[PDB]
Every structure is written in structure tokens, then in C-alpha cells.
Amino acid sequence: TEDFIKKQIEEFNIGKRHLANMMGEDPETFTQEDIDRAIAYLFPSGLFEKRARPVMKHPEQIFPRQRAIQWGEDGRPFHYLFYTGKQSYYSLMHDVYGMLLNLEKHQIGSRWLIKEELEEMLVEKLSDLDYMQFIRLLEKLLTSQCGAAEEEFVQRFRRSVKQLIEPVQYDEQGMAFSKSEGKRKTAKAEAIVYKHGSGRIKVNGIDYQLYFPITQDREQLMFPFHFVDRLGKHDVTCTVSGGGRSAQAGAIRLAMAKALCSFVTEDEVEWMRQAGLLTTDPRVRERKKPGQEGARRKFTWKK
């Protein structure tokens, strides 16, 4: 109730002052971030679920929005649509319909809030079909040449919704290069690509044709440079650890592509991304499960 929440707010203010005193910080400039940090320090909980951890928040954030009593002492409800049982939702629908009637008489930046958001706004429980009806009505309003007078209302229900080029560094000898990293399965590769070079690729201090005697791996190394038409234009020094030959080749390919992004134009970078040369392959070995032969293989069924 309101009196309960008021008492809780008083308790929170007193406790916030106490916590500020405990941590030695200024009570006046003690913010919610400071309170959260202090509580996390004083009551360390490793529980994975953040909600299960200790919390000392404002009562407004803690307690759910309680709908106030909807009638007075005389018993008469306040809203003329009270007996619908969904007074807020139907009031909103009625207002939208009135706006649509007035409009009919006279004449990639945002989305529609979810049913949960609409329920939170209306402090009422809605249904999927009710939400769809309301969204259809709002869409009709949007299409019906809604001006500022209508757009100000409509926007209350709107919710707003490229590779990161590395900086080019310089070695001691003044040569420009770019450093990047990429992981494939268990293989991690750190690749340094120089702006100018004769196409040499030294992996772990070894020439690439020696490190990767497999034509498939050499082709994977080739794929990024060949794509952007820069074969023989760049020198590469790569260090790859972990995984097998193919995982290492893929990781080095990703690292080289990311490093070369610093030296290719933005259109070329986008083309590489579209070709999939900058995506980190998330496919990793799937854990074996108990009671079955492998990740998906099941034991031979015995009818």
C-alpha cells in the first residue's frame, strides 16, 4: 500500500545514509551505482542469477507497480470504462479511435513495444489478440497521415532499435602495420599484417608453405588476400596456438582478414564481411552427454 511504500522509502533513505557512512563516502553524493558497489562488496554473493543476489534498491524499483483502488468512499468507480475490467486498455483504444475519426474527418529507426511493455504501461493484463488489435489500430493511425498532433501520441508506443577497423600502428623502422586476433575452435591466432610487402607469410617463425604443408590450409590462408585482390602486396607474421592444422589455418585466416581490414577500403571491408571472412566461426565441439555414445549418437536401441 501507499503508506507501506512511504515507510519503505524512509527506510531506504536512512539505510542509504548509513551505508554511505559505512563506506566513508559522502552521503549527499552517494548514487545508486555507489550503493550497488558497496552492497556487492559487503555481501559478496557468487550466485549466477543476478536477481538472487543481495539488492538494496529504491522501493520504487523493488516493489511492483500496484494498481490503486479504482473507486472512492461512495463506491462509485473513477473511470467511466471501469466495468469493462480493462479500463486502461479500452480507454487507450477509445482515444485512438477518436483520433482516427478526427483524421478521417479532416483528411528502420523504431519498432512497436512488446505486449509486456504495453502491459507495464497500462498496469493491466492483456492478451495476444488484444495486443494485436491495438497494434493494428496504431498502424492504421500511422498510415493515416498522422501529423505532429498525432505523432506526439503515437511515439509513446515506439521503441528505438560494420567491422571495427583496427588502428594502424608503426614499427621501429617506421613501417605501418595492423595487428589482429582470431579464434577457430581451440586455435587462437595473432596476426600482424604490414602495409607493404612481397606476400611473405611467416607463421610461428616458419614459412607458411612449411607450417601448412596441406593445400587446403594454404588455400585458406590465400582466401582473404585473394578476395580483395592483394596477393603479393602484404607481409604477414602470424602466431597460432592450439587446435589442429585446420583450426589453426582458419584462425589465422580470420586474424589476417581482420588485420587487412585496416588496409582495405570500407567497401572492400563490407564485401569481406558479406563473404564471411570476418565472422568468428562459433561451431565448436559439442560436449558428450551421459548415457549416449557421443554428442548426438545414441546407444544402439534394444527393442
Binding site: 554473493s45 557468487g46 550466485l47 549466477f48 542469477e49 538472487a52
Partner: protein
């Protein structure tokens, strides 16, 4: 159907504390551990001894504060100090609470050769997290 440490649903008249309300798979996710010691860390020893001591302590406290424990004990081990944080009920007389606190501290200290403290937190009635 999994049965381990789950209080099965009922008509809504069964009160359950936070510990009971949560199934095993919520340990380290929504509920902590009722006994904290270094026995189970990597490279540490005496896990079996700590477990046996914990079991005996739980039984002994349950039988020594009958009908008083409002929730599971918490056994903390710091160095050789053993701290038993027990939530109890405000039914037994404070004289008997003090007598039993002193008794348990002394007896457990002599039995396990370690300083034992027993911290009682009293509540009017068992705290109900939800009604199952």
C-alpha cells in the same frame, strides 16, 4: 520424474522456506551452500572429515534445539573456528536458549577440539517464501 530435494506441489496450503522451495539445480544459481569450508576446493584435503562433522553437527543441533530451528543451519569454518548460524523460533524461553547455547558450544568444542560459536537468530515463525 526427478525427486531429489524437491517439495512437490500441493493444494497451496504447504508453507516452504527459500531453501525448500528451490530444487537442487538452483544451488549456486539461486541458493548458496549451507556449509562453507575449504575441503572441496582443488588441492585441499579432509573433505570427508568435514562432511562427517557437518552431518553430525546438523543432527546434534536438530536434537538439541528440538522444535526450535526455523531453518537449516549454516556451518562456517574459518581457520579452526566453527560458527553455527542457526535461525530459531521465539517459543522456547530465553533461559533455555542461553543454557543450550552454552552447552552446545562447550560440548562441541570439546568433541571436535576447536573453538565453536553458536549464533542464534530468532524469528516469530518460520519464514514462508511461497505456498506450495
Amino acid at each position: 520424474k526427478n525427486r531429489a530435494a524437491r517439495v512437490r506441489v500441493s493444494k497451496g496450503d504447504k508453507p516452504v522456506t527459500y531453501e525448500e522451495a528451490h530444487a537442487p539445480h538452483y544451488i549456486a544459481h539461486r541458493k548458496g551452500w549451507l556449509s562453507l569450508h575449504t575441503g572441496n576446493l582443488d588441492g585441499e584435503d579432509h573433505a570427508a572429515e568435514r562432511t562427517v562433522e557437518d552431518v553430525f553437527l546438523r543432527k546434534f543441533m536438530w536434537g538439541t534445539f528440538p522444535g526450535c530451528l526455523a531453518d537449516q543451519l549454516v556451518l562456517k569454518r574459518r581457520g579452526n573456528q566453527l560458527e553455527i548460524c542457526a535461525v530459531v523460533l521465539r517459543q522456547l524461553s530465553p533461559h533455555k536458549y542461553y543454557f543450550l547455547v552454552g552447552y552446545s558450544e562447550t560440548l562441541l568444542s570439546y568433541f571436535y577440539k576447536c573453538p565453536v560459536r553458536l549464533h542464534l537468530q530468532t524469528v516469530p515463525s518460520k519464514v514462508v517464501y511461497k505456498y506450495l
